[PDB]
Design a protein around this nucleic acid. Structure first.
Ligand SMILES: [Mg+2]
Ligand SMILES: [Mg+2]
Ligand SMILES: [Mg+2]
Ligand SMILES: [Mg+2]
Lengths: 338, 338
DNA sequence: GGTCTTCACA
DNA sequence: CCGGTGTGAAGACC
DNA sequence: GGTCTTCACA
DNA sequence: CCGGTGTGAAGACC
């Protein structure tokens, strides 16, 4: 659980434990001995707790301490089972911490979107944790879906085929000369729910924990909307980064530049709302560096110039992130007619 | 020395040693105990040896083995001095190794440029190591300068003022709307020698080793060329990266895109030659990703489309790097009138 | 076609 | 995915 | 001035 | 500046 019960760890299967001993099964070019099964620790620590929608002692806890509990629970378990032999490299912890931060933030945003959809359908406003009720007029057409994009996802398959044809032709013309348009997958994307799923109940209910079925449900939700989202319904794109460095911050800038070039220069979309979340921006000047012009149309000067990154946000708590997302939805869905 | 002489380490002053004890002088927010003095290790290991311009055993040695000698020499010294207490974190070693790679490669390129200039001012072709003599016609107007750019360098101050005013006006127009154009400084830049430095004897003499005076000479050779280089004499720009990851390769792409936007779309330069030098590209797909198009001129598609990165190079030895640079000089400076 | 082993992505 | 660095320029602080 | 301390960059 | 990582998908293999 969230507090490392000893009896709960005892009653786990060997394949369900947070740490897997692979000392007798080495990896090809790695010297790993004990590996961190991040899905197991997500199901263990957050199996029945979702930050921001849990007891008030977890919703107000520092967000740096909520993201960082699974790793220390794993360390405790590994020390219990493999005493004086347990050792996990710091780089493994860094990777797993980044992944856990992204997944937990996505789960919080999913619960917020589920509450918003339940309100919009006209089923009242839930009040188990106290959040401000939006002033927007309820309407089923103003429903959203939060998609956790996979590793090598190009995010163009979410567009309608008539919107994919232009992108395909442009990429084929680029390939004719042997060139390409590589990009990293944005961590998250929020889109308006298509007209066919306006009655489905899977977009109206909240998950009680990050169990393995719920992890699969959250991870596989992108496949339901493939080839269905209009180009103008891409509400928000989020790039999570648990920590920033003066050189590591250029990856989201490149992702945003490529996405805006594809969505604005070719599809005529109004604008792309790309933002970056972080937990420790100290030691850098990201608040000024991210105040950068989009590398699209600068050489011609015929379109309006704007920031490539909408905003850099540092959530202190999960409840603050939930409130920010609710305010963003209330502000954004106003201009969409329904 | 290059092989960790014990008597040579005994003769070093306490401030000239490869490892500094800062256990009694902690840093503000770091837990460092022993610090790797990278300049001291550079002066110790390569104080009388330059790879590619030394004995045939060092020239033909694996480049991954030359880049990595200073770190292990420092580790041996630290074990000798602080036994059973010495410990250096792997991240410090990674940082130092990257810096060593960049600096030694820049030194090799500087020696190649010095020999090229000495040949092209009609002083003959040095032959202590055997390299192919270029077939180009000698002329003083074709000498080159290799510049190791420092951190937070604008690299536009190298341009003549008339060229600088265009970039300044563009940046002021960007700033008026509250925007900006941030970038990282390319690790190196090769430019044609200005007409006032043709008769200088500093650009023809090679260095015997990476002693501290030579380090200062190579690091500070960019101040001499501020406001002298025309916007069309930027021959080559090189980004050094010891190893490539599937996300760390997007920072050179951003650097190249910004550089080409500034030089091709705002100054009328023919083309910018940007290439990446790596030692371990295994584990990623970089020979295909780096085969990408420039995010400039694709909004309307009027100018010809070309690659952002010229080539990704993996040098096996230092002699191969010297030969590549000589071939590049012979091929490129042929198109300079005179 | 079905199970295992490896590799790129992030 | 990230976290631990070495150094040169800017910043107190008399 | 000018000397020691701190911070951002890469 | 970089090196040690977990996982899903593609590649062998009677
Ligand atoms: Mg990602
Ligand atoms: Mg991310
Ligand atoms: Mg650099
Ligand atoms: Mg570099």
């Amino acid at each position: 659980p969230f507090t490392y019960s000893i009896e709960a760890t005892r009653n786990l299967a060997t394949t369900e434990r947070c740490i897997q001993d692979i000392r007798n099964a080495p990896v090809r070019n790695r010297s790993t001995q004990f590996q961190l099964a991040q899905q197991n620790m997500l199901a263990y620590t957050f199996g029945e707790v979702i930050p921001g929608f849990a007891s008030a002692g977890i919703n107000g806890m520092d967000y740096r301490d909520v993201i960082g509990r699974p790793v220390e629970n794993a360390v405790t378990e590994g020390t219990h089972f493999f005493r004086d032999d347990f050792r996990v490299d710091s780089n493994a912890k860094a990777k797993v911490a980044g992944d856990i931060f992204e997944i937990v933030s996505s789960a919080v945003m999913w619960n917020c979107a589920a509450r918003w959809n339940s309100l919009m359908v006209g089923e009242g406003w839930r009040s188990q944790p106290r959040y401000s009720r939006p002033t927007l007029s309820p309407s089923p057409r103003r429903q959203v879906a939060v998609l956790n994009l996979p590793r090598s996802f190009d995010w163009v398959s979410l567009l309608v085929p008539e919107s994919q044809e232009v992108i395909e032709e442009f990429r084929a013309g680029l390939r004719k000369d042997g060139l390409g348009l590589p990009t990293s997958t944005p961590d998250l994307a929020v889109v308006v729910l298509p007209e066919e799923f306006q009655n489905d109940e899977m977009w109206r209910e909240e998950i009680a924990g990050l169990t393995r079925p719920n992890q699969i449900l959250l991870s596989g939700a992108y496949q339901r909307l493939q080839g269905r989202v209009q180009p103008g319904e891409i509400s928000l794109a989020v790039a999570f980064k648990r920590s920033l460095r003066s050189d590591r911050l250029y990856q989201p800038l490149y992702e945003a530049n490529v996405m805006q070039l594809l969505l604005e220069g070719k599809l005529g979309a109004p604008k792309v709302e790309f933002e970056v979340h972080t937990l420790a921006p100290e030691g850098t000047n990201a608040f000024v560096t991210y105040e950068a012009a989009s590398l699209y149309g600068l050489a011609e000067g015929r379109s309006a110039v704007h920031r490539a990154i909408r905003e850099l946000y540092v959530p202190p708590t999960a409840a603050d992130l939930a409130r920010r997302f609710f305010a963003f939805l209330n502000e954004r869905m106003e201009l969409v007619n329904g």
